[PDB]
Structure 1
């Protein structure tokens, strides 16, 4: 019995029914959208991201989680996005079940007085995916913390990180830049308001705005982007809410955030180590804050910069990534032996691209061979989708086993962690196979293969195009004569939505292109082409559909091939 441990004291062992969450794995049910109901653009984006995910289930019976279709994001009475009579309109629902196995997203809970935790309607035993949640009101391993984004935040994809030109020393023109506001006469803004003791008209320009005439005159001198890009550290202080838009803006421009919001759970703090990517400081030591950032070593600054960019591009660039990260966090709460290590989330590529249902052991993924002191596997399984090719593949020292989307399934007959894909008429000699496998051992994350093609921007039609012509560079290596880790097979089977795989099967093409898109999204690196070698409208439509679903172009052009020495 766990009657006493409910409400604020809710945990996964008292307010979450594990019987519903069967082996199928974290199915999420969205309620139907009742007509004549206020719904914000941001909540439309969140709901659409949930629908486009693999966790969506149209059947409430076959679900193990529930997300309301009502606009619970903005719970501010003064806000135009507020929905009235929400408690009555959720208590009317019979599937509410006192909020059992219910997730409630929220961004702006509270009103002008104190902007408290009060969400208005009774949640019962429901998990909160609240932003700007305080540690006092937080429920560890039960509630999730999420980033506070804007209505114009991209629904899918996201802008790439602004950090280019990784210069040494990493410090840029200015050190501490802050530009913002000083909420007068109320709760909140008791740090921003006192960001003038540290101001010196130098690399510590804490220019605020509303004495106020001097502040306003000095505020209208620089540009906010000009000071965000010409900076080392950017404060992310507390205002009315514990979170602000400046967090993601400083996380995108790589400007190493210096947290000055006491008692705020940083977005996804359950799985993300924020000492690697940011400086967390008490607002009661603001006078000491500059000296501390002075004392940070250059190598630490470089690591913080790169980790900031990694975290931005991994979990924050789009709303869809935020929603998927919340879902993955809540999913790992279910099976404690099928969760993710603290290392999976905190380094490249990220927790969104690494699935613990495949394996919880870092050595089963190609992303951690250097952090574990291990080596890439010396054996590869050959998969063919012919007799001379099979003989050539067999005449090698690394071929342990020989075996439209049926070639990317998670076959249990495969033992090794590396897979070589072959087609009917791929003339791949034994020396070529050995060299490709050695190069893959040098570059295990990427795809290593002989056939390559590129993509071009059709400016006459404003679209993407597929070029197989021999050009000065390449951006895509066909997964038909290439060696790659077998984890991507599972990822192909368990990360891409049913729609893309369905169309790839229906048109009986675009499997290698989709695989290249996925691996470039994971690694953020161009594929590796080996040796010279190099022996329609459907493909263009596939490229455009993949670009639409990813929200960006993950493909990257490469001008260098890889050849055997001599």
Structure 2
């Protein structure tokens, strides 16, 4: 560690593992001094870290420290550059040569020969710099982050551009580009040679020489012709009409053009040689982009035409997935950086490459639950595995057991008679003590009763070790069901394991009269929420609710004693990007303040997510031969109609 404690820093030498030493991996942010100008982008990064689940206020507990000084822009000529930063960071008591420090940086270098002049001496801190060259990138230490402007959304999302997936996966043009060319300096070599390849039919490469205020002095013969054609085409309309969007190198290796290319669904053909692509340690960029060498600039159209239709289809879908998962907002970027850091501590608890490069993505797949891909409801097709044929019933009881006619008893035996059930868990969250053992009716499957330590609605979504099946049938105390209904719901779940399969569908909407989201429970022609009161879902969503969600939302849920099912559906629709499944015609599965709390919850969840992840759907999965004029001796699920 003494030999390589410098530019050759790695996570196993220039990083103290003993500070985390537990399942708690926390990140600490230094206080702000109320005397320094702060750019809005670094403030957004700081707010995203502070609002995260990795944030703690105790420097002793945390094992990752974030500076409050603005290190985003290190260009001395930039208006957001902060002077006297070396002495200002060396005077920090917690610096410790920057041992567990993450430094966010977006720009570096002055006018002549732009380089990685970060300004101060970073020491041992890993820098999450934006435009990192390959030879200046520490592989298992640094994180290559995208270059984003100050207008990048804090928590929302542009939601991509590809709303049609039509074959053949080609558009009007094949390669497009419209940006400035620099007649003096470094980094315009690849931009001054685009007229060679420009043809005007499908390869449209537009440039303008107007840079700064003295561009007229150094102009040449070619600039007059090129500048005339510049106004012919609109840049936003151009990226949306090309199968591939050229993303060359400007002054620095990276550019805003990469993220716009990913968003516009056009597969980026990066011509920035020696650019460590954003999050390259976890993302395979051969699946979402074409990497073109700068030396072979003339052969680019040929290599582009050689790409087959299937490859183009895959590339477009993959770039859209990467945008929607990791690069959509600043919170996405910082959470991705923190999780990439986290995966490097406990090696046996990490996300395999199939997790990062596939739906739903690494943000929503937490290895602390299980590193086995079959323990998740998303990777059944990628393996040769079928959904498990057994499920565990969890009953949330809040009323005491006073009479044998209570609905919690008839429901417990109802789930037992099903051929798929493995066991039953009765979460007893009542003020009265636990009922007698003989009070539980005899069942084929074992019955386990757990008395909740904290009688809050978030306890019903805890990852209990007593659940031995990947599937969970979550029922309330007042849930009325038949064995046939449970069997049908589980069989339907077996085709859609990543969703929530349940009876009570509820919908959401936007109320323009109040400019806020609205919760609807009436019979509507469409739905986007099926409540957890009677629904089947993978048990990984329990871990997701327990850990991924912020403490504030769960605390509010506990305080109001409501909105647990709404939040669960929010999380499921966010992870899956698919609407939930409602089964059968069951309109009521039971038997003014509630609605207001639910609507406030919906608005709060939308504010935290930055958008509405719930997706409408106007179909339900009913049994074949349901209410069909056939002899009743042929149907399988006879009792559903009854």
TM bracket (short chain): over 0.9
**Structure 1 residue 425, shift from structure 2 partner:** 1.3
**Structure 1 residue 397, shift from structure 2 partner:** 1.2
**Structure 1 residue 228, shift from structure 2 partner:** 1.1
Q: How far apart in 2 are the matches of 1:554 and 1:377?
A: 28
Q: How far apart in 2 are the matches of 1:124 and 1:140?
A: 17
Deviations 1:263-297 (A, max 9, x none): 11111000000001110111111111111110111
Hey, what does 1:319 align to over in structure 2? Answer: 330
Q: How far apart in 2 are the matches of 1:438 and 1:139?
A: 49
| SS of equivalent residue, structure 2 residue 296 | helix
| SS of equivalent residue, structure 1 residue 206 | strand
CA RMSD in angstroms comes to 0.8
Deviations 1:470-522 (A, max 9, x none): 11111111111010000010010110000000000000000000000101110
Deviations 1:35-79 (A, max 9, x none): 211210000100000001111010001111111000011111000
**Structure 1 residue 165, shift from structure 2 partner:** 1.4
| SS of equivalent residue, structure 1 residue 464 | strand
**Structure 1 residue 533, shift from structure 2 partner:** 1.2
Deviations 1:340-364 (A, max 9, x none): 1011100000000000111111111
Q: How far apart in 1 are the matches of 2:42 and 2:81?
A: 12
Q: How far apart in 1 are the matches of 2:7 and 2:347?
A: 23
Deviations 1:121-176 (A, max 9, x none): 01111111011101101111000000000100000021101101111101011111
**Structure 1 residue 434, shift from structure 2 partner:** 0.9
Whether 1:496 and 2:549 are equivalent positions in the alignment is: yes
| SS of equivalent residue, structure 1 residue 232 | strand
Q: How far apart in 2 are the matches of 1:155 and 1:256?
A: 25
Q: How far apart in 2 are the matches of 1:449 and 1:423?
A: 13
Rg larger for: 2
Q: How far apart in 2 are the matches of 1:376 and 1:223?
A: 50
Deviations 1:205-262 (A, max 9, x none): 0111111122122111122121111110001111111111111111011111111111
**Structure 1 residue 438, shift from structure 2 partner:** 1.0
Q: How far apart in 1 are the matches of 2:381 and 2:512?
A: 42
Q: How far apart in 1 are the matches of 2:245 and 2:166?
A: 18
Q: How far apart in 1 are the matches of 2:558 and 2:162?
A: 39
**Structure 1 residue 25, shift from structure 2 partner:** 3.0
Hey, what does 1:457 align to over in structure 2? Answer: 510
Q: How far apart in 1 are the matches of 2:113 and 2:494?
A: 57
Hey, what does 2:248 align to over in structure 1? Answer: 237
**Structure 1 residue 179, shift from structure 2 partner:** 1.0
Hey, what does 1:368 align to over in structure 2? Answer: 379
**Structure 1 residue 203, shift from structure 2 partner:** 1.1
Q: How far apart in 1 are the matches of 2:260 and 2:164?
A: 18
Q: How far apart in 2 are the matches of 1:139 and 1:400?
A: 49
Segments of 4+ moved more than 2 angstroms: none
TM-score (ref. length: structure 1): 0.99
**Structure 1 residue 455, shift from structure 2 partner:** 0.7
Q: Gapped runs of 5+ residues in structure 2?
A: 210-221, 397-407, 426-456, 589-594, 626-642
| Greater shift in the superposed pair: 182-191 or 523-532 | 182-191
Deviations 1:157-208 (A, max 9, x none): 2110110111110101111111111122101121122111110111110111
Hey, what does 1:382 align to over in structure 2? Answer: 393
Q: How far apart in 2 are the matches of 1:447 and 1:197?
A: 55
Is the 1:67–1:102 contact (alpha carbons within 8 Å) kept by the matching residues of 2? yes
| SS of equivalent residue, structure 1 residue 421 | strand
TM-score (ref. length: structure 2): 0.87
Q: How far apart in 1 are the matches of 2:237 and 2:104?
A: 34
Is the 1:46–1:323 contact (alpha carbons within 8 Å) kept by the matching residues of 2? yes
| SS of equivalent residue, structure 2 residue 16 | coil
| SS of equivalent residue, structure 2 residue 546 | helix
Q: How far apart in 2 are the matches of 1:448 and 1:375?
A: 17
**Structure 1 residue 26, shift from structure 2 partner:** 2.1
Q: How far apart in 2 are the matches of 1:428 and 1:459?
A: 38
Q: How far apart in 2 are the matches of 1:34 and 1:24?
A: 32
Q: How far apart in 2 are the matches of 1:197 and 1:447?
A: 55
Hey, what does 2:157 align to over in structure 1? Answer: 158
**Structure 1 residue 24, shift from structure 2 partner:** 3.4
Is the 1:38–1:70 contact (alpha carbons within 8 Å) kept by the matching residues of 2? no
Deviations 1:77-131 (A, max 9, x none): 0001101111111111111001111111100022212220110101111111011
1:299 corresponds to which of 290, 298, 310: 310
Q: How far apart in 2 are the matches of 1:20 and 1:453?
A: 45
Q: How far apart in 1 are the matches of 2:483 and 2:156?
A: 40
Deviations 1:390-435 (A, max 9, x none): 1111111111111001110011111111101001111121111111
Q: How far apart in 2 are the matches of 1:472 and 1:267?
A: 43
**Structure 1 residue 307, shift from structure 2 partner:** 0.4
Q: How far apart in 2 are the matches of 1:220 and 1:373?
A: 54
Q: How far apart in 1 are the matches of 2:611 and 2:76?
A: 36
